[PDB]
Amino acid sequence: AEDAPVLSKAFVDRVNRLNRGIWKAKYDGVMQNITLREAKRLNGVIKSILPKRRFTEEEACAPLPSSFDSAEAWPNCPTIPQIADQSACGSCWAVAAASAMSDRFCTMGGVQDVHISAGDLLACCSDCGDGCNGGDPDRAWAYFSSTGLVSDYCQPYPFPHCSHHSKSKNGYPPCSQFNFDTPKCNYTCDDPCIPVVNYRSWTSYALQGEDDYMRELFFRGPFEVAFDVYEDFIAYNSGVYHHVSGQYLGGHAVRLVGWGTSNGVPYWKIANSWNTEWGMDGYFLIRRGSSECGIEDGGSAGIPLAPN
Numbered sequence: 424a425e426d427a428p429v430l431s432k433a434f435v436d437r438v439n440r441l442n443r444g445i446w447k448a449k450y451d452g453v454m455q456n457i458t459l460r461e462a463k464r465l466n467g468v469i470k471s472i473l474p475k476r477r478f479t480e481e482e483a484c485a486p487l488p489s490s491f492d493s494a495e496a497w498p499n500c501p502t503i504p505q506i507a508d509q510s511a512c513g514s515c516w517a518v519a520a521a522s523a524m525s526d527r528f529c530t531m532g533g534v535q536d537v538h539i540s541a542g543d544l545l546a547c548c549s550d551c552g553d554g555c556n557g558g559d560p561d562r563a564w565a566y567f568s569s570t571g572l573v574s575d576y577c578q579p580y581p582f583p584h585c586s587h588h589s590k591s592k593n594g595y596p597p598c599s600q601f602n603f604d605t606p607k608c609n610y611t612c613d614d615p616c617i618p619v620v621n622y623r624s625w626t627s628y629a630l631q632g633e634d635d636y637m638r639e640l641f642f643r644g645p646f647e648v649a650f651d652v653y654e655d656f657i658a659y660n661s662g663v664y665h666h667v668s669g670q671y672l673g674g675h676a677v678r679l680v681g682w683g684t685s686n687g688v689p690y691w692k693i694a695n696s697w698n699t700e701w702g703m704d705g706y707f708l709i710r711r712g713s714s715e716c717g718i719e720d721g722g723s724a725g726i727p728l729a730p731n
């Protein structure tokens with residue numbers, strides 16, 4: 424909608440006061456100068472077509488910890504702790520997915536480093552939605568079930584690291600400088616000196632509610648969840664976020680990579696698709712058990728098929 428910045432030092436300070444210092448919102452953070460229309464852009468979930476997840480007796484009848492990081496359960500999967508930068512697209516839906524299919528190619532797919540192309544997914548699945556006007560996580564995985572994607576070595580994400588700071592530590596351009604339409608769906612690799620490689624799942628499925636999220640994350644590794652972003656979420660800097668103030672900005676897809684307890688507050692460690700500048704080194708914590716902003720509502724995962 425408006426060119427109205429989303430963060431006001433009244434707003435942030437009211438939010439900070441409301442949240443009961445459980446999580447520090449921040450005014451002069453990395454999103455301070457953000458536009459209503461920009462922030463809505465970032466949240467690209469629009470619109471089950473996947474079968475619901477069946478736990479084997481022993482999956483369901485097992486003892487999940489009360490902390491868990493995928494990075495640490497899988498020290499040898501470099502894909503996990505890497506943080507993506509969707510950029511100035513409503514591409515989170517695709518970026519969220521590819522990030523986890525990369526990770527699952529390691530956790531199960533017997534391929535250490537392979538970054539699945541959010542490029543490929545974001546352009547070529549017209550089933551999923553309309554590139555950078557947003558799409559459906561469910562579909563993303565159904566396409567990796569049906570069609571399959573190429574790696575980011577083949578169709579590297581076509582939008583650079585842009586920043587939402589004046590001065591940037593990691594010396595990025597501003598995101599207020601760009602705004603990107605769906606890219607050309609290509610059928611060979613960007614470089615022609617590189618061959619195409621199909622990567623697919625032999626089964627995608629869907630998840631629901633606190634528990635299923637923890638079993639699925641544990642056994643099979645990070646996967647893709649969405650929640651409703653509220654203005655307040657933009658100012659987030661530390662601690663376990665929960666919606667206290669601000670208008671709804673759309674549905675935003677993120678990679679669930681952990682859970683844990685902080686001074687008696689249940690949380691989900693999550694990998695946010697906006698740079699490593701935003702939140703806590705690119706990640707955020709969100710309240711868990713409340714299904715806060717509906718995080719525990721819709722979850723999308725799959726088992727990467729090991730090639731040849």
Ligand SMILES: *[C@@H]1O[C@H](CO)[C@@H](O[C@@H]2O[C@H](CO)[C@@H](O[C@@H]3O[C@H](CO)[C@@H](O)[C@H](O)[C@@H]3O)[C@H](O)[C@H]2NC(C)=O)[C@H](O)[C@H]1NC(C)=O
Pocket residue numbers: 542543544546578579580581582606607608609613
């Ligand atoms: C499919 O292939 C093409 C590459 O042939 C990709 O579209 C191209 O995206 C590149 C960046 O990845 C664009 O470069 C840009 O050019 C404009 C100048 O007009 C400039 O403003 C930007 O700073 C940047 O240098 C290129 O123009 C664009 N070309 C076409 C034909 O779309 C596309 O992103 C690829 N899709 C996937 C899924 O990787």
Ligand SMILES: *[C@@H]1O[C@H](CO)[C@@H](O[C@@H]2O[C@H](CO)[C@@H](O)[C@H](O)[C@H]2NC(C)=O)[C@H](O)[C@H]1NC(C)=O
Pocket residue numbers: 451452453455456587588589590
């Ligand atoms: C938010 O907006 C303004 C842009 O008008 C930024 O203010 C200037 O930033 C430069 C360096 O980046 C400083 O040298 C000046 O002191 C600032 N004031 C001026 C030019 O009057 C501000 O830094 C922006 N903040 C963020 C975090 O983006």
